[PDB]
Design a protein around this motif. Sequence first.
Motif, short mmCIF file in Angstrom:
data_model
loop_
_atom_site.label_atom_id
_atom_site.label_comp_id
_atom_site.label_asym_id
_atom_site.label_seq_id
_atom_site.Cartn_x
_atom_site.Cartn_y
_atom_site.Cartn_z
N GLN A 78 0.86 -1.17 0.00
CA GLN A 78 0.00 0.00 0.00
C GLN A 78 0.90 1.22 0.00
N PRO A 79 0.82 2.09 -1.01
CA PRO A 79 1.68 3.28 -1.05
C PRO A 79 1.63 4.07 0.24
N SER A 80 2.82 4.40 0.75
CA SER A 80 2.98 5.09 2.02
C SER A 80 4.09 6.13 1.95
N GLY A 81 4.06 6.98 0.92
CA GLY A 81 5.12 7.95 0.73
C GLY A 81 6.14 7.64 -0.34
N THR A 82 6.28 8.53 -1.32
CA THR A 82 7.20 8.30 -2.42
C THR A 82 7.90 9.58 -2.82
N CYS A 83 9.09 9.40 -3.37
CA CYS A 83 9.90 10.44 -3.98
C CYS A 83 9.78 10.21 -5.47
N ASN A 84 9.14 11.14 -6.17
CA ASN A 84 8.89 11.03 -7.60
C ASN A 84 10.01 11.67 -8.41
N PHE A 85 10.92 10.84 -8.92
CA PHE A 85 12.11 11.36 -9.57
C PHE A 85 11.80 11.82 -10.99
N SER A 86 10.57 11.61 -11.46
CA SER A 86 10.12 12.11 -12.76
C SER A 86 10.00 13.63 -12.78
N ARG A 87 9.99 14.26 -11.62
CA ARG A 87 9.84 15.70 -11.48
C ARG A 87 11.03 16.27 -10.73
N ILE A 88 12.10 15.51 -10.62
CA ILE A 88 13.33 15.97 -10.00
C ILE A 88 14.40 16.11 -11.06
N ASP A 89 14.85 17.35 -11.28
CA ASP A 89 15.75 17.63 -12.39
C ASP A 89 17.14 17.11 -12.09
N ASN A 90 17.56 17.23 -10.83
CA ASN A 90 18.87 16.79 -10.42
C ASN A 90 18.82 16.07 -9.09
N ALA A 91 19.10 14.77 -9.11
CA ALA A 91 19.06 13.89 -7.95
C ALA A 91 20.50 13.45 -7.76
N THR A 92 21.07 13.67 -6.58
CA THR A 92 22.46 13.28 -6.38
C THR A 92 22.64 12.47 -5.11
N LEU A 93 23.41 11.38 -5.19
CA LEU A 93 23.76 10.66 -3.94
C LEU A 93 25.24 10.89 -3.59
N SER A 94 25.49 11.53 -2.44
CA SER A 94 26.83 11.89 -2.01
C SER A 94 27.35 10.81 -1.08
N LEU A 95 28.49 10.21 -1.44
CA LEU A 95 29.08 9.14 -0.64
C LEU A 95 30.48 9.50 -0.16
N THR A 96 30.68 9.42 1.16
CA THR A 96 31.93 9.72 1.84
C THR A 96 32.44 8.38 2.33
N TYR A 97 33.72 8.09 2.09
CA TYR A 97 34.31 6.81 2.46
C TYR A 97 35.12 6.88 3.76
N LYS A 98 35.22 5.72 4.42
CA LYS A 98 36.13 5.56 5.55
C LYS A 98 37.56 5.42 5.04
N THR A 99 38.52 5.87 5.84
CA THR A 99 39.93 5.74 5.46
C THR A 99 40.38 4.29 5.66
N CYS A 100 40.95 3.70 4.62
CA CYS A 100 41.26 2.27 4.60
C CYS A 100 42.70 2.02 5.05
N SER A 101 42.99 2.41 6.30
CA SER A 101 44.32 2.39 6.89
C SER A 101 44.65 1.18 7.74
N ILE A 102 43.69 0.36 8.11
CA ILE A 102 43.99 -0.70 9.06
C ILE A 102 44.54 -1.91 8.33
N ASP A 103 45.62 -2.49 8.86
CA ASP A 103 46.19 -3.69 8.26
C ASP A 103 45.19 -4.80 8.58
N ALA A 104 44.56 -5.36 7.54
CA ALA A 104 43.54 -6.39 7.70
C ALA A 104 44.02 -7.66 8.39
#
Lengths: 35, 282, 63, 436, 435, 434, 48, 48
Positions: E362-388
């Motif tokens: 049952q629809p319970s809230g949506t983000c309609n990207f058909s009316r979004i001109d610019n959609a961006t996902l910003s991803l920040t990474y962890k520093t990969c310093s630990i010797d595994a």
Amino acid sequence: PLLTPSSQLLPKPSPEAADFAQFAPKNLQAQNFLT
Amino acid sequence: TCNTFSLNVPVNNSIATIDFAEHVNGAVFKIEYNRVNFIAPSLYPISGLGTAVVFDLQKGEKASQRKITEFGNKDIRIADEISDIAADDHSVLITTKLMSESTPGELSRDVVLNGEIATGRINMNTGFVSDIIHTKKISIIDDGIVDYYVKINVPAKYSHGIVEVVSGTFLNDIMIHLVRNKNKWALMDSKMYIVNNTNGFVIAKNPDTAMGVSLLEWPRGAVVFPPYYNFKKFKNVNKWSISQQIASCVNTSVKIPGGEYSWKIRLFFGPIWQVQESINSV
Amino acid sequence: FRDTASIGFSDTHQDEKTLRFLKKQISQFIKHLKEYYPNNELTKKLVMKYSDVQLLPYTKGAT
Amino acid sequence: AGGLSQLVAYGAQDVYLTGNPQITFFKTVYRRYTNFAIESIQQTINGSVGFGNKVSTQISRNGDLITDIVVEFVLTKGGNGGTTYYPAEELLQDVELEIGGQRIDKHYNDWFRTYDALFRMNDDRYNYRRMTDWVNNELVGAQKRFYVPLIFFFNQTPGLALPLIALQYHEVKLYFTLASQVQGVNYNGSSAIAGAAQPTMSVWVDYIFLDTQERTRFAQLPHEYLIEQLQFTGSETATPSATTQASQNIRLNFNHPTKYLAWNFNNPTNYGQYTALANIPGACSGAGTAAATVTTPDYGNTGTYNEQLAVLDSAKIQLNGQDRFATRKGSYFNKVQPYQSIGGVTPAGVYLYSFALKPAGRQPSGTCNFSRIDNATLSLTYKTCSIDATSPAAVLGNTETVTANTATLLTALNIYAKNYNVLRIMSGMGGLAYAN
Amino acid sequence: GGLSQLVAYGAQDVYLTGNPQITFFKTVYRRYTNFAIESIQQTINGSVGFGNKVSTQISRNGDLITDIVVEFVLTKGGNGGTTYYPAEELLQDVELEIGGQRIDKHYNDWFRTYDALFRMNDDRYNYRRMTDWVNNELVGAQKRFYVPLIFFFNQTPGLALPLIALQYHEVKLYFTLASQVQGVNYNGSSAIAGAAQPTMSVWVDYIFLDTQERTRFAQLPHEYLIEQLQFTGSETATPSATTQASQNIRLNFNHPTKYLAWNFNNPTNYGQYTALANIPGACSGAGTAAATVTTPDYGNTGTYNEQLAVLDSAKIQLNGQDRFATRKGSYFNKVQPYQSIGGVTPAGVYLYSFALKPAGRQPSGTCNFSRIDNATLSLTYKTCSIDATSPAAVLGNTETVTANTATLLTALNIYAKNYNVLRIMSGMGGLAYAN
Amino acid sequence: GGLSQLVAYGAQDVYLTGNPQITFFKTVYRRYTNFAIESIQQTINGSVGFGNKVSTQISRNGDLITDIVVEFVLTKGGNGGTTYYPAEELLQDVELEIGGQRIDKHYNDWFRTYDALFRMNDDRYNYRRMTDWVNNELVGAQKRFYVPLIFFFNQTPGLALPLIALQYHEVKLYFTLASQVQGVNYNGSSAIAGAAQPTMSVWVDYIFLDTQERTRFAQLPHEYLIEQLQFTGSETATPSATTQASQNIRLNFNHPTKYLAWNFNNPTNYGQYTALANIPGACSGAGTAAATVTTPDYGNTGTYNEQLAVLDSAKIQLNGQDRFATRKGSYFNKVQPYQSIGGVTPAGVYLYSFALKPAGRQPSGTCNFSRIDNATLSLTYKTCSIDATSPAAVLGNTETVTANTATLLTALNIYAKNYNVLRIMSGMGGLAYA
Amino acid sequence: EIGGQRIDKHYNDWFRTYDALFRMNDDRYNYRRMTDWVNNELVGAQKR
Amino acid sequence: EIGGQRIDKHYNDWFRTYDALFRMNDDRYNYRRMTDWVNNELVGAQKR
């Protein structure tokens, strides 16, 4: 004049079943009489 | 139908009540007292009466009923004491038959005249026999007068009751009544359809020997005189009709609990002088 | 896009019945000792085994 | 910016979802309910309680409706950890329920395990185990109070609570048949355990007390209850040895609209063993060591999930000689069917086929009415039992159509059918619309 | 007894039991449509095999279609712990077409994301039972696997495909079967000689309707509100040392969307969304001198230890403006599943919802990207310093770092699940919205 | 095949498929009000730290409030197994206040009981993932934790607080953070040198509505049917040998109540509701020569072995009348939550329900304690005579006797969830029943 | 299969029973050469 | 933000960019005096 597909049913559906039931009022009355 | 209601019921005062002190009989109405004859074929409690005369051969006094309509339209939901349409077959459940010399009674479970068949313009009720219970008691009194009392009860009602339906010999043209103000008798028969209000203290009709109709009691919620609708009236045409209305089609919020309520009518006959002389006792 | 008027789901000629259906036929034919009656009643027994139909009309716009 | 920006992004597609709104999520309205109270009342058991005995109880009438029934057992361990496997369920061989002397339903040992192994899910199945077994590596002498809820049509749901208030002239009774032997309490396998104590049992029923207006409603008016029933007769299987693939045509004798058929194969010696024994972890006593005895389970772990140890290769149901579906392998009935129809996990050896879309629910969702067929056959194909069960490298390393040589011990075939019926109650008297 | 609280009736009760509307102990069941469910096999078009494409045309053998399950027979090319949902990996993808228009497409990595987010409790464990070896089975073991499909109509009968109403359309599933199947065809990246080809058959559960319903569905038009999965693969920016990399991901989604979900995947080790480390069950041989952090302990590929995950923080922008304030990676892995689904999601799989109940239909809230001109996902990474290879350093560190082995999660997978409408009339069907 | 079933229509079916009312294969979806969800960080007023009290006033960013999640940054001072829901015990007191009137107040121990009773399967596991260290990680490990709040408006959107129409009375929460956290600041009562102060952030999820309904919320009055927690803690007597104690414990409850939940805890060890014993997971070092029953193996603080629980029996008595017949301790730990919740309640946590479905939102049966002058809970205890260091007796004794270390579980915490009505009119919110 | 309905199913064992029961004389000798290696073929021999 | 709605947000790099673009002359210098050490100050100095 319209051409249509045919859906064949066969007679197999049969007529539907019935069910009847009831409790005879075996309870009658109580404390209505005593011997 | 567990229909439960709290405070949407007006205080309708069952001022009238009917009880019995007679014995059980089979299925015949053969009654007489002080030369007043009373006959009914057991198709329903009343057929005719008189003193070496009759007032009709059929369609005598009978109690009837009208359930809740779209707006008081016509004989759609009529739960009548007799299956009059069948005429010969009384296809009605008559539960108790009490009578004694000079006064018969009866207690009956009524039927809807139209029955389960979807006819006319609108559909009807479920089966032929309804759960509405009604009674009648006919008390013949020494003075040559007879008191007719009827009862109706059914749960959760607000409908229209028909106290008497009488279709006597067409010889009933002259129509005269005493005004409640005792100012005069008012002779009015020109309309042949008069709706008499409370001013009609007692009404009489006669081709030569008269029958009088005197209403005594009807339920009313007048304990505090609320504005709630509750009125009675006549529908006087060739067929004599007495009815009482509890409510219009649907009110803002209306129910009646459905207890026992009854109506009292005094009926008597005789020379127009004697009929008026008794009435003028008022 | 593919014209396949029938589904092909064992509907059309397949008589799915429990053999107790024989009682249904006996009621219609009234007599129960139908060990022998069907041998003298071939024309009626065949009619009782043929179909009825429903149609699916649609209209489209011509160009 | 923020959430407001997602309302700005509005268009043509959205009217289909949010145009002229019918509902909201952020102002909910709750329906008012008839006032009631719940009370647990102890019942009196007729007859001495003990192993192999038959006792019954007459249900008292403190409440109006019955919503749940819980049977209490007091047991002491006859051995150390791992010697028991749902002993409270082995102890209760059956329960028969009647109204006015008319049987409504009956449950069996090895049904409770089938239901628990099929419809109860993780926490609720574990908690159930907690109520019926020793789940904490308890040692000999440990004493615990065990609670076996019953699963009749009116149990664990208020919706079909049995209206005693409407059964004014009829008696309601439960007949309890107790086990002659319980594994880890009285016997360790076939070896009697000296000094084993008799159980103490109490039958508890949870009563519902209604408010005055509904209390009256129930007493006066007729009722039509749609109920569940269990149908069962025990069969004999045909588990194969070597060079062969057994088959059976097990003809069924069931009679009402049915939600599902569920079944298993078991070793009648060991309550709940639905799989073959093998020399792998948790499957046998001493498994993994030189002391392993491949003919005796590690009882506390009698159920497993490795279907390789089960005997069903394939099955199909036939109706009047016409195949009801195309043959499915045993893994379909053990894993795929309950995944799509229930949503739980079924252990190896327990099998389900449903006629219903949601057999775990109580509202009808598709039924097979066996009352109108000539016959139903459950055709079974078995796995060849040639794997040497004493070698873990063998039972963990073979083909689909083979299983353990020890599998031939699974000699009992239990086919259960769960149906719908109608319980009619009028004028203080109760009974079924259709006899069963 | 119970009468104690029953009559203990006061003012505080009026809004609970006054003028009662329902009674909990008298249920009314609805009488339903007469139907039966049947499983039959489909016609498998094409040569079944590793790396091959196979098409299954759904034979019109019923009125409505609901559950579809693909079964495979595989053998182990290795011993216990070397496999990870072989049947789920094998089914590299399936797409659904009606009348030749694509309705949806699901990927093996998507199946993992869905299992990680929406399938939960017992169904997840039984799911694995259907797709993997979970009883420490050894090389040579044979097992029949079942992969239920998760199209919009595969979880509820209410969205069953009305083939009776599609007299002029064919409905097809196109399957791609993976060339790389871990523990069957390759042990790591080394081919396993003699491995057998899979045997596949596709099962469909058909619904048979009775007479009156069959007609209603055959004649009337229908509008089905359905789910679609939108996917394009991208590339991660996992760092080396001394820095916290970030990248801006350009989203190309449309239609009302319930949620965005994503992971960071090792393209060679199926289902690996975290770094490997010398921690028990976190790499092959973990805890012993033979441990290596270059090869996973495959049957334990999934983990719940967020320290092996690479997402430090994420933000979504709507037309360039922040949609919500920046949140840390553990929010998307642990809290949204909690708020929106009620299950547990293993580390490395992330969810942000737009819907109150995305697990429902049952629809319970949506983000309609058909009316979004610019959609961006910003991803920040962890520093990969630990010797595994040193668990003292991996199990003894802070929020902003992870292991050096994390740089293998080079594949970025952004998923969106949206709504659409499937319109069917006069024996023909197609989608309502295209963009 | 299936058609062989369709035709099998008999008399038994007139109650199932005759005159169908519902078609399972048709679906109707309902159109809703367009809205958006946003997680927005709130300002914490006050210095955040151990033993400190801070508060936050919710900024009216949106129209309605649903969930609230409190974030902690914690570094452990011990090794794996030295912690047990440290984020949950730190969040000691959470008080919900609207305009000066207390609406509800939750306690860290309540959160543990709620998690012990009502969160179940993967949900309880994911919960712990948010609040504890669950992968055997070691001293020095640091990560961010989340403790979702469980007030009446947090778990279901239908009871969200409409700030848009609550403008005169502000909604704020008060937070007390525990002075002692096991494995972070103290090992038992022994302080951990160098332990860092927490960092905390309170995140609130806002609902944004579209124009048409947003106005309606802003102008019309509202009534919400909501839950409240009732609590006062007490002290009980748990004897060791020769005496089996019982107490008639006086309750302090008023409004229509769904259930009474309780535990007996060791005040120094958060979540310890059972005795410690020299068995697996039941105490520090259990099974080895270093085992001690004075200190738990904290990561396994909770158990399911009712043998280490204290309650022998209980009954609720209302004004001298037994409201149900005497039950033994195992019912309230095992059977009631089976009947009412369907989950696994750990040993030492007890539940008695009045509601059919206390886990749900719709009222399903209540006890109105405002109409009870004197409500009590009678508790019968087990005799605590078993030597906790000897598994031969701890895993092998009678049902009515427990471990001698049980005598430390002296704090009795009885919780109740009641209904009330929250009315908001002309910008002011408040409780209908005091 | 014809129209979604199963019309028949034959097994190798049935082909063996039919050949061993209703196919007779020269017709069966031919059948054997249709389904077997008859004229003493050796290892490696191919047959259609 | 005003009333809960974010209307603007500035970043340290923006402040420097703004200083780089629009603050000029004596004003840019004075700004620098307020944000940095401009007089050869040494380690340990405390500045407002």
